[PDB]
């Protein structure tokens, strides 16, 4: 019916997104051919909470999503439908309906440049309590009222943009990991992606 799915360009990107601004590429009307995605390199995460990846090729869906971002090592475990953490409930949260995969991989082989990785940040400071999809794109200051700051020095407020310090001369646990998740949802609409039968 359609051509091959463009997933080949999702797992091979030239510049991924950040945590405060993450991609939300909607995929629909393609083929679910995971035969190539199954026999990939020995990555560190190939878990799919929804269903088995073998039977996924015979399951129809209306529209699927793809969200790619970059986190540290100790933050990979926080990606779960309901869990505490500095990123799990502050910057990247998922409701209790995720039926996709949490496939991720390390890419600390080509980023060996000791010059300051001040390009990626996760916005540790936030005031999100509900709405698990509460994103943030502006460059405001961390405040909660009560005569907020209006300067640059501060000393009572702070600039809510904490960049990473990824350096090649580090050990395990604090390494960069590119994580791509596939959000699935079904509404009152005919299905588009089913997979080769």
């Amino acid at each position, epitope marked *: 019916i*359609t*051509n*091959l*799915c*463009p997933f*080949d*360009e999702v797992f091979n*990107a*030239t*510049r*991924f*997104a950040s945590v405060y*601004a993450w*991609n*939300r*590429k*909607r*995929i*629909s*009307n*393609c083929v679910a051919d995971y035969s190539v995605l199954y026999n990939l390199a020995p990555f560190f995460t190939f878990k799919c909470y929804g269903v088995s990846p073998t039977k996924l090729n015979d399951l129809c869906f209306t*529209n699927v999503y793809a969200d790619s971002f970059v986190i540290r090592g100790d933050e990979v475990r926080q990606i779960a439908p309901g869990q505490t953490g500095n990123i799990a409930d502050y910057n990247y949260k998922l409701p209790d309906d995720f039926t996709g995969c949490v496939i991720a991989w390390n890419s600390n082989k080509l980023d060996s440049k000791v010059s300051g990785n001040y390009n990626y940040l996760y916005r540790l400071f936030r005031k999100s309590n509900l*709405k698990p*999809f*509460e*994103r*943030d*794109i*502006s460059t*405001e200051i961390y405040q909660a009222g009560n005569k907020p700051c209006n300067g640059v020095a501060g000393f009572n407020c702070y600039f809510p943009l904490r960049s990473y310090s990824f350096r090649p001369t580090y050990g395990v646990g604090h390494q960069p990991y590119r994580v791509v998740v596939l959000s699935f949802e079904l509404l009152h609409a005919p299905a588009t992606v089913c997979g080769p039968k």
Partner: antibody, heavy 122, light 112 residues
């Protein structure tokens, strides 16, 4: 920096077929999502549909779902739009716009082009 | 989801700075960035910012963009009113379903 030429904007009776071509020029056209947008006379802009850069992912809006298709050619890059079973609300000026680089799909939009006026009368 | 409502067209005398507001229709502004476009009557729309907020493709300092969480709206500031500024403008963004949402439009008029 993007040339856009189509066939025409001749009217058609309700329940017809129309093919719009959005062949462009330049040098950077490998993988860029293309968005078909419309604007009704006396009304603001209205997004119609979109397609990914590689031509795999393609979807439409809610009111124009089921009777419109959009495809993309790469080696002779061109954005084809097939419109079937037109209604009285389809009379509008249509445009085909580019976007930013291949990483972000919902961030960045380059020059659009010219567009053409399609009318549906009886 | 819902088309973002855009206020009525405005007019301004030359030599001043104008501000256009764009309010979100439903939900919150906690989504992707909101951009603007300059469409002259009878001409094709032209973007005011190239990618996110930095130096666009030919507008040196006229157009600038900001986001206000207190009012939960986008603000387009246009300094140095010229004869080529009297035209229609639309604020466009994306929703949580990868749909391109536009605004109602606003005509900026220059007094002669």
């Amino acid at each position: 920096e993007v040339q856009l030429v189509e066939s025409g904007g001749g009217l058609v009776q309700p329940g017809g077929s129309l093919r719009l071509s959005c062949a462009a020029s330049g040098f950077t056209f490998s993988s860029y999502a293309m968005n078909w947008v419309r604007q009704a006379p006396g009304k603001g802009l209205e997004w119609v549909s979109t397609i990914s850069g590689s031509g795999g992912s393609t979807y439409y809006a809610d009111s124009v779902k089921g009777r419109f298709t959009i495809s993309r050619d790469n080696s002779k890059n061109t954005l084809y739009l097939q419109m079937n079973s037109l209604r009285a609300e389809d009379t509008a000026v249509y445009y085909c716009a580019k976007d930013s680089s291949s990483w972000y799909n919902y961030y960045g939009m380059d020059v659009w082009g010219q567009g053409t006026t399609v009318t549906v009368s009886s | 989801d819902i088309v973002m409502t855009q206020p009525h067209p405005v007019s301004e005398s030359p030599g001043k700075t104008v501000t256009i507001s764009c309010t979100r229709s439903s939900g919150s502004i906690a989504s992707n960035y909101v951009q603007w476009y300059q469409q002259r009557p009878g001409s094709a729309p032209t973007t005011v910012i190239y990618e996110d907020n930095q130096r666009p493709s030919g507008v040196p300092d006229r157009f600038s963009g900001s986001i206000d969480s207190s009012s939960n709206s986008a603000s387009l500031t246009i300094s140095g009113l010229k004869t080529e500024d009297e035209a229609d403008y639309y604020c466009q963004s994306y929703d949580s379903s990868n749909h391109v949402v536009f605004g109602g439009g606003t005509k900026v008029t220059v007094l002669r």
